[PDB]
Amino acid sequence: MKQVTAIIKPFKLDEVRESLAEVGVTGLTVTEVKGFPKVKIEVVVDDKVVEQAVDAIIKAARTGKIGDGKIFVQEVEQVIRIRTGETGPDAV
Amino acid sequence: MKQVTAIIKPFKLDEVRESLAEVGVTGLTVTEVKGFGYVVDFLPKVKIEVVVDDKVVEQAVDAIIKAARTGKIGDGKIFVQEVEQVIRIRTGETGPDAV
Amino acid sequence: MKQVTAIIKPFKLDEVRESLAEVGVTGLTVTEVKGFTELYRGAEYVVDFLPKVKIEVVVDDKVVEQAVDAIIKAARTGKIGDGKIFVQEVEQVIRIRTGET
Known part of the structure; x- marks a missing residue:
């Protein structure tokens, strides 16, 4: 799993979030x-979708x-969902 | 050394802080x-970030x-990432002396 | 490529930023x-x-030790x-305008 970080101009937040949403x-x-003033966006995804998300x-x-x-890409060793305690890929 | 990040609801901050402090x-x-949403x-959310020695990770997450x-x-x-180095500004202690 | 992160007292930001410019x-x-009392x-x-300030810079591996210093x-x-201060690897850096990496 990867953490994708993006530092963008504030007025693009809406378009960015819409295009991300379209690839799930x-x-x-x-x-x-x-x-x-900038906006930083951080999203932790499955390795299987980093290319789509960066694009x-x-x-x-x-x-x-x-x-x-x-945009910066970094590895994530582990992801835990708090509510359920699910771990890794199904924690996304 | 591991960086532990968590993104929690705002008003759970005080509890999380106290529960971490119990585990050192x-x-x-x-x-x-x-x-x-x-x-x-x-x-509103709150992001918390702490860098810990490798062996403390499990109980920090717990x-x-x-x-x-x-x-x-x-x-x-919660997410956990690797940190290559940690330096304590005041003294210059690096690594596990710096955590 | 490394991400350097420092968490420093807020009145030291100009001085840090001046020191960093001297090493490029x-x-x-x-x-x-x-x-x-604070309002929320x-x-x-x-x-x-x-209050603190976090500074983050992503640099070439060769530059880390002089950035840290x-x-x-x-x-x-x-x-x-x-x-x-802490140092992390960055797997990939992309410039948006161009696609440089």
Whole structure:
């Protein structure tokens, strides 16, 4: 499982979340950050969908002008859902 | 060393903190974040983050579960990632001396 | 590629950022965070938060030790609560505008 992070311009949040949702990725976390105003988006997905999710972020946030932001990919060792205690892939 | 992250409901913060502290885990970092749910959409959440030695992970995870679980949708999730190095600014202690 | 993260006292941010520029690191991401009366969604709560700032930078492996060194020297006051730095691997970095990776 992977954690996909994206730092994007605030006005793209709505489009980003819509394109993610169209490939089935929900469960986003959003934080307001300052880039030296941006929005950070974090989503922990199954390895089987990282390519689709990265591409849907690039599809929606790419305006084309300077400052569209970056995306970062990192491994996640384990994911636990609190309510049930399900672990790994079925915790997504 | 492992970073333990959890995204929990806001008002479960105090309990989680106290339950961690019972298992010896302090040094929490707290960030206010949004999650997505008339059905409300934009929701308050709180992200907690702590870096622990490898052997403490299981009981750190155990303690967060005990304190936050209600058995309803919205209780949140925990993730655990690897950290390559930890440095304590004040002294320069690295690794397990730094946790 | 490494993600360097530091959690520092809030009045040290300009100084840290100046130190980092001297070793060539400039694109910082800054988050306001808390450690252990305040208002929350309109109601007063008695709490014992301390405000901190998280700084995050993603750099080339070769640059880490000089980034780390630059933060330590600028952020230290010598007091308790100075904070901590940690390093993580980043599997892939994509620039949105272009597709550079």
